[PDB]
C-alpha cells in the first residue's frame, strides 16, 4: 500500500502539488522540481486552474508555472513542448518585451503574468499521484 | 488499500491538515472541522510548529487553531482539555480582555495571537491519517 502523494504535498485529482520553499529564477525553479521527480505546474484544464487559484488564494506571492517562450513572436509552450490551450487564461505583464533568457509565466492573485525568466519568484511543482 | 488523507488535504506524520475555504468565527470554524470528521489544529510538538509555520509562510492571514480560554483567569487549553506544552510558543495580543464568546488563538507566520472568538478568520483542521 503506497500513498498517492508524499507527505507535505497536496493530492488533487491525478497529481501532487508542492510550493517551492524560496524565490528563484525560472531555470533554478525547473531544476528544483526535477530534483523532486516533478515538473513546474502545467495547467491543461479549467479544473486545474480552479484548484491552483484556490490553493494560492491565501498568498500574494508570484508562483512560476512551466510556461515560457523565447520572445513575443513565439508561441507559449509548457516544459514538455506542448502548447498553451488558448481558452484557459489571458497573460498580463511584460507581453510585448523581449529578454535575453526569454519570457516565463507566473500566477499571482489567480491571474497570469509574463516576465523576464532570470527574475526570481516562488514556484509550484507537480507530479503524477501513485494510483496504480 | 486506502490513502492516508483525502484529496485537498496535506499528509504530515500521523495527521491530515486542511486549510478552510471560508473565513468564520471560531465556533463555526470548529463545526466545519467536525463536519469533515476533524478538529481545529492542535500543535503538540516543536515539529508540528515548524511544519505549520512553513505551511503558512506563504500567507499573511490569521488561521484559527484549537486553543482558547473562557476568560483571562483560566488557562489556555486545546479543545481536547490538554494544556499548552511549555516552550512551544508565547500567546501575544490582548490576552487580558474579556469577550462575550471568550478568547481564541490564531497562528500567523512566526507568531500566535489571542483574539475575540467572534472575529472571522480562516482556520486549519486536522484528523488522524489512515496508516
Amino acid at each position, epitope marked *: 500500500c503506497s500513498a498517492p502523494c508524499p507527505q507535505d504535498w497536496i493530492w488533487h485529482g491525478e497529481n501532487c502539488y508542492l510550493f517551492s520553499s524560496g*524565490s528563484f529564477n525560472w531555470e533554478k525553479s525547473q531544476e528544483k522540481c526535477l530534483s523532486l521527480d516533478a515538473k513546474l505546474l502545467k495547467i491543461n484544464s479549467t479544473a486545474d486552474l480552479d484548484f491552483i487559484q484556490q490553493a494560492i*488564494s491565501y498568498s*500574494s*506571492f*508570484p508562483f512560476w508555472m512551466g510556461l515560457s517562450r523565447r520572445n513575443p513572436s513565439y508561441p507559449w509552450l509548457w516544459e514538455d513542448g506542448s502548447p498553451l490551450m488558448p481558452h484557459l487564461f489571458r497573460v*498580463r*505583464g*511584460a507581453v*510585448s*518585451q523581449t529578454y535575453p533568457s526569454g519570457t516565463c509565466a*507566473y500566477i*499571482q*492573485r*489567480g491571474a497570469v*503574468y509574463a*516576465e*523576464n525568466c532570470i*527574475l*526570481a*519568484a516562488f514556484s509550484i511543482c507537480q507530479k503524477k499521484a501513485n494510483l496504480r | 488499500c486506502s490513502a492516508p488523507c483525502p484529496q485537498d488535504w496535506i499528509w504530515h506524520g500521523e495527521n491530515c491538515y486542511l486549510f478552510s475555504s471560508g*473565513s468564520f468565527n471560531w465556533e463555526k470554524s470548529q463545526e466545519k472541522c467536525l463536519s469533515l470528521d476533524a478538529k481545529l489544529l492542535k500543535i503538540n510538538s516543536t515539529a508540528d510548529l515548524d511544519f505549520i509555520q512553513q505551511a503558512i509562510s506563504y500567507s*499573511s*492571514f*490569521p488561521f484559527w487553531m484549537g486553543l482558547s480560554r473562557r476568560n483571562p483567569s483560566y488557562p489556555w487549553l486545546w479543545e481536547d482539555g490538554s494544556p499548552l506544552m511549555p516552550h512551544l510558543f508565547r500567546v*501575544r*495580543g*490582548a490576552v487580558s480582555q474579556t469577550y462575550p464568546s471568550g478568547t481564541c488563538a490564531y497562528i*500567523q*507566520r512566526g*507568531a500566535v*495571537y489571542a483574539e475575540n472568538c467572534i*472575529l*472571522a*478568520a480562516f482556520s486549519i483542521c486536522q484528523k488522524k491519517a489512515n496508516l
Partner: antibody
Amino acid sequence: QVQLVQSGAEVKKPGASVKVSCKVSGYTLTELSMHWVRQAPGKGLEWMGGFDPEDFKYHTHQKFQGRVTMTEDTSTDTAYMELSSLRSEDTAVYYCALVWGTQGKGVRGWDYYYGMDVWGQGTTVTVSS
Amino acid sequence: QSVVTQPPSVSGAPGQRVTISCTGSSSNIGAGYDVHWYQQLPGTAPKLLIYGNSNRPSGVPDRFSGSKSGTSASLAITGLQAEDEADYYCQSYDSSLSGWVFGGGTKLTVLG
C-alpha cells in the same frame, strides 16, 4: 543598498510648472519601480503615479492627468516629475520613492507585496503670487 | 469604493496596546492586494513600517504587527512608547483605478 536624492525647494507662481529630480545611487534605475507621492501641509499622503507591473507601464492618478509627466534618464539614473498649471493646492512636499524589496532580483509583480521602502528626502514646492 | 479609510485619531497610554483599521473594498484589499503601513514622526518623511500586511522591515521592532481579513487590515502596537507618537498611513493598490491608494491617515497620541 540604494539612496534617492531630490532637487532643492522651489517657489512658483500659479500657472507655472515645476520639475523635481530624483537621483538614484547604489543600483540602476532601469531595473527599479519609481513612485511619486506628495503631502500638502497638515494633509495626508497622495499617490501621484509610478510603475505598474500589471501592464509594465507608468500610471498617473486620474486626478492629475494632463498635468503630471514622469520621465527617467537611463544615463544619470535620474527620475523627473513635472507638474504643470500649478495652483495653491499644489503647495506640498513632493517625494520620490522606490520598491527595493527584491534588490532588482525579483519579478516586478513582487511590488504589490513589498511596498515603498526607499524614500527621497522630499522637495518643497510653494505655489504663491 | 476605490478608497481605503482610517480613523483620524487613536490614543493610548505608555505600555498599552492600540489598533488602527484600514477599511478597503472588493477593488483593493479584497482583490488580493496587500496593505502597507507608513510611520511619519513629526517633521520627518514617511517610512515603511509594515509591508505585505504583516512583515517588518529591518529596524522595525516586534511590537508592531499587522493582519488582513476580507476587505480590511489592522495595525497593532503593543507597549506604546512616546517615540511612537506619529501619523500612520495605510496603503493598498486598487485594480478599478489601476493605481495605489493611501488611507486618510491616523494621528496616534501617546497620552502624556
